[PDB]
Design an enzyme around this catalytic site. Structure first.
Site, PDB file in Angstrom:
ATOM      1  N   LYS A 158       0.840  -1.210   0.000  1.00 46.35           N
ATOM      2  CA  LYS A 158       0.000   0.000   0.000  1.00 46.35           C
ATOM      3  C   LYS A 158       0.867   1.250   0.000  1.00 46.35           C
ATOM      4  CE  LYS A 158      -3.160   3.023   1.020  1.00 46.35           C
ATOM      5  NZ  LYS A 158      -4.294   3.242  -0.017  1.00 46.35           N
ATOM      6  N   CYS A 192      -1.994  10.119  -6.655  1.00 50.37           N
ATOM      7  CA  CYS A 192      -3.124   9.981  -5.705  1.00 50.37           C
ATOM      8  C   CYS A 192      -4.171  11.112  -5.955  1.00 50.37           C
ATOM      9  CB  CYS A 192      -2.602   9.992  -4.254  1.00 50.37           C
ATOM     10  SG  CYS A 192      -4.031   9.648  -3.167  1.00 50.37           S
TER      11      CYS A 192
END
Ligand SMILES: Cc1cc2nc3c(=O)[nH]c(=O)nc-3n(C[C@H](O)[C@H](O)[C@H](O)COP(=O)(O)O)c2cc1C
Ligand SMILES: Cc1cc2nc3c(=O)[nH]c(=O)nc-3n(C[C@H](O)[C@H](O)[C@H](O)COP(=O)(O)O)c2cc1C
Ligand SMILES: *C(/C=C/c1cccs1)=C1C(=O)NC(=O)NC1=O
Ligand SMILES: *C(/C=C/c1cccs1)=C1C(=O)NC(=O)NC1=O
Lengths: 313, 313
Positions: free
Chosen positions: B44, B131
């Site tokens: 992650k 992101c």
């Protein structure tokens, strides 16, 4: 229970119309869209001179939507201006005219000529700043400096209310900047969100090949692929441009999909890919399906739910 | 016959791996991805310090894909670094570690500490520049001057081969410019196309509500919605970055979808939404399906068809 709207000084039987480029290139297409149940129509984006557009195949449709690289094709501004002046029956429904010159000069040239027709007949301008399929000419509205110039010059040359067809954005800072550019221009009375999601690539597994010929297969995406992107841009400008109208475009196949656009803030709802696939009979279906949703929920008019999407906490 | 490959001075049993963020946050998750039949795994994306991420609900899946605004959530860099340095069994498959600091300084601080573990163990850096879900902190790769500054500073501080997780682009000039920024950096050896399609909006018609809580319902899209966008970016960077590898991510649910990614240019193929929905059993299915398509077409290696998508004329 009622789909009527009254905006920009026109009356609309219902919020539906074609998306620019679909079923609106020839006189025949324009008559067909007029004879349909749509609330309005928009003409094909035009350049000053007639053009052929790109080599075929340049459009393909699939279960989840469409890809296209139509490129330049239109009968030219003279033709769309005459349609608006001489041929369009305004007693049937309102007409919007889409322009997409290749330079600010070309656009200004055109809008100078459209103004008297707009004043006389009530034709509405939609200015296209988001074509993703001309090589060496990226989407104008992805260059915010260029965008502000085009809008300055056109507001100055045209001097009447108009709208803008926008490309989709993907980044909160771009929503903030783009709405702020637009809000510098009070003659921008409507914002159509969105044009195609640019430069996707569909590949056929059997043939191992791209499915459209121009630009090595790259083209703009429409249809089911783009509904959440369309709804995002519709609401993002609805929230950021409280003095303007937002027209929704992208992913509409059903009255439910139109309901979502309307919740997100849409006034008019445009139909591209689904109309290309289904034909103009879609408009009666969308009307019936949207009324059915309204009936079930107790909504009697569009403004009872327009822009009233709920957020969580 | 067997799908095995070599890249980045490692060996992989097949081109399949998780997409960062899916099934890779906890030690349990990483152990589960290691136990699966994927060819690799990626952790992650992490920040220097642990964080909780956004309020729930922050992920929702639908027939056509997913929306998420997960935001910050990770056990922090110290945890992932220790997984890489002490816990991962490198005999089973390679590991990538994804980092996503909130400033260039934070990323520099992490890669300085990762460097020694990369030298010792061969863990591979995937730097995340895309992101779409930190408020105030837009996709770094949509600002080309910021992207160059991040890649200069990381390259100087790390000094070892790495990769970049890219956001999708929609504009040929953007592809040209982003690929030329990447090509300024010889240590950038792979490019992962794509992160989620940012800031879409899903709306539930019955409830009249957005479906995720952060950012007024706006979140990144994954899944079937994004396959043609993913394929386009994979091919765009594959064409423009001849000395780098392109890893494909976006819209993979089947061996056929993997086949398309590999035709477009993908070396590895990452699986997000579909893996989140099906679980790690998907990997055996994807392998079986890809081998079967290869058989049916008489391909024995992936090299035979990687990047060999055909264009028309
Ligand atoms: C065949 C085709 C032609 C199009 N031509 C134009 C055009 O001339 N001007 C324009 O603003 N958008 C044009 N578009 C974009 C559509 O107006 C619309 O924004 C896009 O298709 C998304 O709506 P949809 O999801 O309903 O298809 C075209 C789309 C298609 C599929
Ligand atoms: C729940 C969730 C968490 C994610 N977290 C990350 C992350 O931490 N880092 C990252 O680079 N991408 C992250 N992504 C993006 C995925 O790696 C992937 O790029 C995206 O989901 C598109 O692939 P898909 O179509 O297979 O879902 C996340 C996606 C999801 C759905
Ligand atoms: C491009 C605009 C094309 C024009 C041709 C003549 C005048 S303007 C397109 C667009 O805006 N949207 C699309 O989806 N496809 C196009 O080719
Ligand atoms: C954001 C990155 C989030 C991080 C949280 C801790 C370190 S980095 C996401 C991303 O890159 N892609 C997504 O689809 N979702 C995200 O939330």
């Amino acid at each position: 229970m009622c789909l009527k709207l009254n905006l920009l000084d026109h009356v609309f039987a219902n919020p539906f119309m074609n998306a620019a480029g679909v079923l609106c290139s020839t006189e025949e297409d324009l008559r067909c869209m007029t004879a349909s149940s749509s609330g309005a129509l928009v003409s094909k984006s035009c350049t000053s001179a007639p053009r052929d557009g790109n080599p075929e195949p340049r459009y393909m449709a699939f279960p989840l939507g469409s890809i296209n690289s139509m490129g330049l094709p239109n009968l030219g501004f003279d033709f769309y201006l005459k349609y608006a002046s001489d041929l369009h029956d305004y007693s049937k429904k309102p007409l919007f005219l889409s322009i997409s010159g290749l330079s600010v000069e070309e656009n200004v040239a055109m809008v100078r000529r459209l103004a008297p027709v707009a004043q006389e007949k009530g034709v509405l301008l939609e200015l296209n700043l988001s074509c993703p399929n001309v090589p060496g000419k990226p989407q104008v509205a992805y260059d915010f400096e260029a965008m502000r110039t085009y809008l300055q010059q056109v507001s100055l040359a045209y001097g009447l209310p108009f709208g803008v067809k926008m490309p989709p954005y993907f980044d909160i800072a771009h929503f903030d900047t783009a709405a702020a550019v637009l809000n510098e221009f009070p003659l921008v009375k409507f914002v159509t969100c969105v044009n195609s999601v640019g430069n996707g690539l569909v590949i056929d597994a059997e043939s191992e090949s791209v499915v459209i010929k121009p630009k090595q297969g790259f083209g703009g995406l429409g249809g089911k692929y783009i509904l959440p992107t369309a709804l995002a841009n519709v609401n993002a400008f609805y929230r950021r441009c409280p003095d303007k109208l937002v027209f929704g475009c992208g992913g509409v196949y059903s009255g439910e999909d139109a309901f979502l656009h309307i919740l997100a803030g849409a006034s008019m709802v445009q139909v591209g890919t689904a109309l290309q696939e289904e034909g103009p009979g879609i408009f009666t279906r969308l009307e019936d399906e949207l009324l059915e949703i309204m009936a079930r929920k107790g909504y009697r008019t569009l403004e009872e739910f327009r822009g009233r999407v709920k957020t969580i906490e």
